[PDB]
Design a protein around this motif. Structure first.
Motif, PDB file in Angstrom:
ATOM      1  N   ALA A   1       0.704  -1.266   0.063  1.00 24.68           N
ATOM      2  CA  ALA A   1      -0.021  -0.053  -0.089  1.00 24.68           C
ATOM      3  C   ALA A   1       0.831   1.232   0.081  1.00 24.68           C
ATOM      4  O   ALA A   1       0.395   2.407  -0.094  1.00 24.68           O
ATOM      5  N   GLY A   2       2.228   0.834   0.091  1.00 20.77           N
ATOM      6  CA  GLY A   2       3.249   1.935   0.311  1.00 20.77           C
ATOM      7  C   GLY A   2       3.640   2.669  -1.027  1.00 20.77           C
ATOM      8  O   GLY A   2       3.467   1.887  -2.077  1.00 20.77           O
ATOM      9  N   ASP A   3       4.108   3.786  -1.011  1.00 18.95           N
ATOM     10  CA  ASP A   3       4.512   4.482  -2.114  1.00 18.95           C
ATOM     11  C   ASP A   3       6.242   3.829  -2.361  1.00 18.95           C
ATOM     12  O   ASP A   3       6.821   3.998  -1.388  1.00 18.95           O
ATOM     13  N   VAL A   4       6.497   3.786  -3.641  1.00 19.77           N
ATOM     14  CA  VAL A   4       7.848   3.303  -3.980  1.00 19.77           C
ATOM     15  C   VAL A   4       8.335   4.332  -5.037  1.00 19.77           C
ATOM     16  O   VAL A   4       7.884   4.924  -5.707  1.00 19.77           O
ATOM     17  N   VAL A   5       9.847   4.246  -4.967  1.00 23.17           N
ATOM     18  CA  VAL A   5      10.446   4.889  -5.990  1.00 23.17           C
ATOM     19  C   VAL A   5      11.524   4.150  -6.497  1.00 23.17           C
ATOM     20  O   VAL A   5      12.187   3.157  -6.099  1.00 23.17           O
ATOM     21  N   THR A   6      11.612   4.410  -7.954  1.00 24.84           N
ATOM     22  CA  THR A   6      12.459   3.407  -8.847  1.00 24.84           C
ATOM     23  C   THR A   6      12.962   4.296  -9.882  1.00 24.84           C
ATOM     24  O   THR A   6      12.615   5.536 -10.560  1.00 24.84           O
ATOM     25  N   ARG A   7      14.067   3.802 -10.592  1.00 29.97           N
ATOM     26  CA  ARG A   7      14.416   4.318 -11.836  1.00 29.97           C
ATOM     27  C   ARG A   7      14.309   3.639 -12.918  1.00 29.97           C
ATOM     28  O   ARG A   7      14.530   4.098 -14.145  1.00 29.97           O
ATOM     29  N   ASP A   8      13.454   2.357 -12.914  1.00 23.96           N
ATOM     30  CA  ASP A   8      13.345   1.488 -13.979  1.00 23.96           C
ATOM     31  C   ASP A   8      11.837   2.220 -14.733  1.00 23.96           C
ATOM     32  O   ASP A   8      10.815   1.993 -14.336  1.00 23.96           O
ATOM     33  N   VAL A   9      12.059   2.571 -16.021  1.00 25.18           N
ATOM     34  CA  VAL A   9      11.180   3.225 -17.096  1.00 25.18           C
ATOM     35  C   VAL A   9      10.055   2.249 -17.234  1.00 25.18           C
ATOM     36  O   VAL A   9       8.856   2.444 -17.669  1.00 25.18           O
ATOM     37  N   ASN A  10      10.717   0.844 -17.351  1.00 27.81           N
ATOM     38  CA  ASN A  10       9.394  -0.230 -17.601  1.00 27.81           C
ATOM     39  C   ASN A  10       8.286  -0.330 -16.365  1.00 27.81           C
ATOM     40  O   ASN A  10       7.583  -0.936 -16.641  1.00 27.81           O
ATOM     41  N   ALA A  30      14.911  10.504 -14.565  1.00 26.54           N
ATOM     42  CA  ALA A  30      15.665  10.420 -13.257  1.00 26.54           C
ATOM     43  C   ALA A  30      15.287   9.421 -12.192  1.00 26.54           C
ATOM     44  O   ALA A  30      15.919   8.414 -11.802  1.00 26.54           O
ATOM     45  N   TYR A  31      13.996   9.575 -11.759  1.00 25.48           N
ATOM     46  CA  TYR A  31      13.401   8.654 -10.873  1.00 25.48           C
ATOM     47  C   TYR A  31      11.887   8.753 -11.295  1.00 25.48           C
ATOM     48  O   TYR A  31      11.454   9.722 -11.789  1.00 25.48           O
ATOM     49  N   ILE A  32      11.239   7.726 -10.673  1.00 21.57           N
ATOM     50  CA  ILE A  32       9.580   7.557 -10.546  1.00 21.57           C
ATOM     51  C   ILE A  32       9.144   7.390  -9.353  1.00 21.57           C
ATOM     52  O   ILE A  32       9.444   6.242  -8.776  1.00 21.57           O
ATOM     53  N   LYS A  33       8.368   8.112  -8.771  1.00 18.23           N
ATOM     54  CA  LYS A  33       7.493   7.626  -7.747  1.00 18.23           C
ATOM     55  C   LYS A  33       6.223   7.028  -8.095  1.00 18.23           C
ATOM     56  O   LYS A  33       5.416   7.837  -8.655  1.00 18.23           O
ATOM     57  N   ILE A  34       5.790   6.009  -7.367  1.00 23.20           N
ATOM     58  CA  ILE A  34       4.578   5.315  -7.697  1.00 23.20           C
ATOM     59  C   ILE A  34       3.960   5.389  -6.378  1.00 23.20           C
ATOM     60  O   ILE A  34       4.170   4.841  -5.354  1.00 23.20           O
ATOM     61  N   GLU A  35       2.559   6.193  -6.382  1.00 21.49           N
ATOM     62  CA  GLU A  35       2.054   6.592  -4.950  1.00 21.49           C
ATOM     63  C   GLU A  35       0.557   6.043  -5.252  1.00 21.49           C
ATOM     64  O   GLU A  35       0.177   5.844  -6.419  1.00 21.49           O
TER      65      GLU A  35
END
Length: 127
Positions: A1-10, A30-35
């Motif tokens: 349920a938590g928000d994640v950060v990643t550099r993986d554009v996939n 640069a990065y993506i926050k998935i919220e």
């Protein structure tokens, strides 16, 4: 349920990847926050290496385009809104645009926010 950060554009929806590749080819992710929001809906907050910030919905449709001190690419601005901006806020740069179910909010370089309905009708100045 938590928000994640990643550099993986996939990890971004295809539509978001395509949008970035088409319209921001001068830079890269640069990065993506998935919220998750209060409705437990997923959004993607993307930082580009040049500092630009984009937000996308669960389907990869853009919600906010923040070009910081540069102009939003004009393709993103509805024609009715660009007409209005030219007539009323001429010579000013729109540096950020946000769209939602209620309309559009364009933010100028000076921080003025110009609000429109979903049809591109002027509503008000805000911030």
């Amino acid at each position: 349920a938590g928000d994640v950060v990643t550099r993986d554009v996939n990890k971004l929806p295809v539509a978001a990847r395509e949008m970035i590749g088409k319209h921001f080819s001068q830079t890269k992710v640069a990065y993506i926050k998935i919220e998750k929001d209060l409705f437990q809906t997923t959004s993607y907050d993307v930082k580009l290496a040049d500092g630009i910030e984009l937000e996308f919905n669960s389907k990869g449709e853009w919600l906010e385009i923040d070009c910081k001190n540069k102009s939003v690419p004009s393709t993103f601005i509805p024609q009715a809104i660009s007409k209005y901006m030219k007539a009323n806020y001429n010579g000013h740069k729109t540096v950020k645009i946000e769209r939602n179910r209620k309309g559009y909010e364009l933010t100028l370089e000076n921080g003025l926010e110009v609000d429109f309905d979903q049809f591109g009708g002027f509503l008000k100045l805000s911030d």
